[PDB]
């Protein structure tokens, strides 16, 4: 609280462009089409994907393509002061935005009059959950085998005591002077488009163009961990058959 950066390493020791400890696991849920458990530092997340399923009772169905729903729920025990079960404004909000990501990327034209439904719970919440949730949901999507154009990978670029930082932690959010969640389409091993972009703090024109750059580093880093996980899953379906 007195000062964010001492010596040039943050309060938990990381660099300026050092992600937190990530952990990612596909196919954790029996009764779901795809799933993923993941953690980003202290965040503990799990995404589930159901679909393409018939969409009911009726009428809400789009005739030319598929519809994507995305519910982002924090559990009561996830936060310091027990949250109260139910959609915050923040929730309805994060859900529209997170859902909009995947709308760009999923190949919904392949599945007319149908739903592809995404639900993601936060079991433990820290700075960045919203970003952990997207990564998770992205893995579940691939796990569920919904045809996509590529991958969605997401990181928060923050800023503490005048300097930018990667994957901000709590205190840096609570006493930082920025907080900027990105999420890119990765196609062909590289970062292409922006899928999700949300800034709110004080940042120069030139700080912002920088920050974009700091982000697509964390992204290739995480994307790889995402590949590693969908690969581990690959070996497993392969081992179960080979039996």
């Amino acid at each position: 609280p007195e000062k964010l950066i001492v010596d040039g390493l943050r309060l938990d020791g990381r660099k300026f462009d050092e992600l937190r400890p990530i952990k990612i696991e596909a196919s954790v849920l029996k009764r779901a089409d795809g799933s993923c458990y993941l953690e980003m530092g202290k965040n503990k997340v799990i995404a589930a994907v159901f679909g393409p399923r018939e969409v009911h009772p009726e009428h809400l169905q789009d005739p030319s393509k598929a519809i994507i729903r995305y519910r982002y729920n924090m559990a009561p025990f996830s936060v310091e002061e027990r949250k109260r079960p139910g959609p915050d404004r923040r929730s309805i909000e994060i859900s529209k935005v997170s859902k909009e990501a995947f709308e760009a990327v999923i190949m919904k034209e392949l599945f007319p009059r149908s739903a592809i439904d995404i639900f993601v719970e936060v079991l433990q919440a820290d700075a960045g959950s919203r970003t952990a949730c997207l990564n998770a949901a992205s893995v579940a999507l691939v796990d569920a085998g919904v045809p996509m154009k590529g991958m969605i990978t997401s990181v928060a670029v923050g800023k503490a005591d005048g300097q930018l930082v990667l994957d901000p932690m709590k205190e840096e959010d609570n006493f930082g002077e920025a907080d900027m969640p990105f999420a890119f389409l990765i196609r062909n091993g590289k970062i292409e488009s922006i899928a999700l972009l949300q800034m709110d703090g004080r940042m120069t024109r030139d700080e912002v163009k920088q920050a974009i750059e700091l982000a697509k580093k964390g992204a290739l880093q995480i994307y790889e961990m995402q590949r590693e996980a969908i690969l581990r899953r690959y070996i497993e379906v392969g081992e179960e058959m080979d039996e």
Partner: protein
């Protein structure tokens, strides 16, 4: 390592011919799904680490009879045998009397009852169905009177509770709870 993530570049279009699992955009082919990229006769496909089944001519299929018009049973095709994942192209298909059985049948209601669950092969497009094979048939029926599940006895179906009796096109696997 033949493994691919969605977004991986398989190659150029004029070069390779798009197959299952693959999309094009800018003349390049791409992997839409995670899995083992396979290539044969210039055709590039991707075996998905989690395939979404598609129903097609040839397949075996589970369904419920949702509406009996005349000479025509509308079955609600639900599952595609051999894959647990719900298909992408499920919905209504047609069980026309000609196909109900190899013998001759009139008044299709005497083969296939309202709300019957059945087991059928897809013989045409648009989920058109055949019941003719021995395997194919009604898997479960409710008493047309007291709505109790009908027990198979012989070549006919009987209601225990109510003793009534109904004649149907009966899959061998009737009552077995398998299909």
């Amino acid at each position: 390592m033949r493994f691919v993530m969605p977004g991986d570049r398989i190659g150029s279009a004029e070069e390779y011919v798009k197959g299952e699992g693959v999309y094009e955009e800018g003349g390049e082919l791409f992997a839409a799904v995670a899995g083992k990229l396979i290539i044969k006769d210039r055709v590039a496909k991707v075996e998905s680490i989690s395939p979404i089944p598609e129903i097609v001519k040839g397949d075996v299929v589970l369904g419920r009879v949702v509406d009996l018009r005349n000479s025509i049973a509308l079955i609600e095709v639900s599952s595609k045998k051999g894959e647990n994942r719900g298909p992408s192209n499920r919905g209504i298909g047609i069980l026309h009397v000609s196909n109900v059985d190899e013998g001759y049948v009139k008044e299709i209601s005497e083969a296939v009852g309202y709300l019957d669950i059945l087991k059928a092969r897809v013989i045409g497009d648009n989920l058109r169905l055949s019941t003719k094979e021995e395997e194919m048939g009604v898997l479960r029926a409710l008493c047309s009177n007291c709505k109790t599940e009908m027990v198979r006895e012989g070549d006919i179906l009987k209601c225990p509770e109510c003793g009534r009796v109904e004649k149907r096109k009966i899959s061998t696997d009737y009552g077995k709870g398998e299909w």
